[PDB]
Amino acid sequence: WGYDDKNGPEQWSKLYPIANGNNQSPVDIKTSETKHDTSLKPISVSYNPATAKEIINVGHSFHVNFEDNDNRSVLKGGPFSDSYRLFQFHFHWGSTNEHGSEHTVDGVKYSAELHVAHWNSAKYSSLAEAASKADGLAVIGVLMKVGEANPKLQKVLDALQAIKTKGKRAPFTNFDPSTLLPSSLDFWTYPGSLTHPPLYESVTWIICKESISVSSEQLAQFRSLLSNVEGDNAVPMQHNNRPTQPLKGRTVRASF
Ligand SMILES: *CCOCCOc1cc(C(F)(F)F)cc(C(F)(F)F)c1
Ligand SMILES: [Zn+2]
Numbered sequence: 071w072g073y074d075d076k077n078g079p080e081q082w083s084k085l086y087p088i089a090n091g092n093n094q095s096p097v098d099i100k101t102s103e104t105k106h107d108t109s110l111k112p113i114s115v116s117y118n119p120a121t122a123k124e125i126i127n128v129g130h131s132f133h134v135n136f137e138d139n140d141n142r143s144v145l146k147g148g149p150f151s152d153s154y155r156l157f158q159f160h161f162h163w164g165s166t167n168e169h170g171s172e173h174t175v176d177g178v179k180y181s182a183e184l185h186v187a188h189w190n191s192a193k194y195s196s197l198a199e200a201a202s203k204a205d206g207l208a209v210i211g212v213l214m215k216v217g218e219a220n221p222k223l224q225k226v227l228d229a230l231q232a233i234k235t236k237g238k239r240a241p242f243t244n245f246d247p248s249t250l251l252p253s254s255l256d257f258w259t260y261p262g263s264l265t266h267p268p269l270y271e272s273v274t275w276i277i278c279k280e281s282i283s284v285s286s287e288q289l290a291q292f293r294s295l296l297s298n299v300e301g302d303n304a305v306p307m308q309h310n311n312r313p314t315q316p317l318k319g320r321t322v323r324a325s326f
Contacts, residue, residue: 071086072129073309079313086267086268088263088271092316093271093318094269094271094315095262095264095265096172098175098314099277100322101324104258106324107149107323107324109149110323111148115210115248115251117136117156118142119244121143122242123135123136123137123241124239124241125229125239126238127233127234127238127296129237129297130310131162134159134242134247145188145208148257148259149259150208152193154190154191154207156187156247157189158187159184159186159247160185160187161183162311163309164182167181172311172314180214181284181289183211183212183213186210186250188209188210189201189208190206200272201270204261205274207270209274215284216286217285220283226245234296234300235299235300237299238300253280256325257325258276258324259324260317260323265312293308293309
């Protein structure tokens with residue numbers, strides 16, 4: 071699978087029938103139809119910088135992984151009674167500054183999107199186990215808006231030089247992902263899935279109501295990464311965002 075016409079989101083249903091499922095992400099969040107939930111508690115994130123492990127070029131994108139051995143970096147509050155263990159964060163972007171996000175609000179596309187992923191360490195003992203469980207994954211979605219350069223992104227962007235080509239790996243240590251999150255943690259939440267194969271419908275989404283900035287040049291650095299392996303012809307990762315999906319009667323709750 072990929073993001074080209076030959077193997078893109080339109081072709082995913084071939085090898086991943088769940089793509090045409092009822093709990094698929096991303097989706098369009100219509101604020102007028104979001105339901106405020108009294109039971110929702112504030113989102114609480116406590117990450118340990120020492121947890122940061124490495125950064126990897128995976129052809130279609132890049133993953134910044136963390137040590138998920140213990141509960142040093144966890145996610146609490148929200149719709150969760152359980153505690154979720156951070157393991158990775160990554161980005162999604164488009165070929166132009168205008169429409170590169172995955173989630174949309176009131177039909178409004180953003181430039182990019184940050185995903186901070188966690189797995190249910192209260193019920194399960196591994197990401198592999200939790201990945202296919204409805205209550206296995208919790209992902210924070212932060213919408214990124216084109217504008218002034220984001221200084222918080224620089225340490226990540228500076229590391230992309232060591233993972234230029236597909237398969238390249240590099241140590242990525244001493245970093246707190248929460249520094250990338252917006253000032254406020256007000257959020258929408260809805261039962262969703264992974265935005266790319268395997269497309270497991272096992273994700274409880276936490277979409278921040280507040281967005282963060284990113285310069286056009288910083289977005290250019292994302293597309294600067296190569297989807298090809300070393301030595302081969304350079305093929306930049308121009309985009310890796312999935313179109314919004316049918317909400318299928320799902321309810322998007324609001325904490326505000
Ligand atoms: C590319 C780095 O690999 C580390 C783990 O990869 C996974 C990431 C995700 C994520 F939620 F981030 F999209 C999901 C999965 C899984 F669902 F388990 F396949 C693996
Ligand atoms: Zn994602």
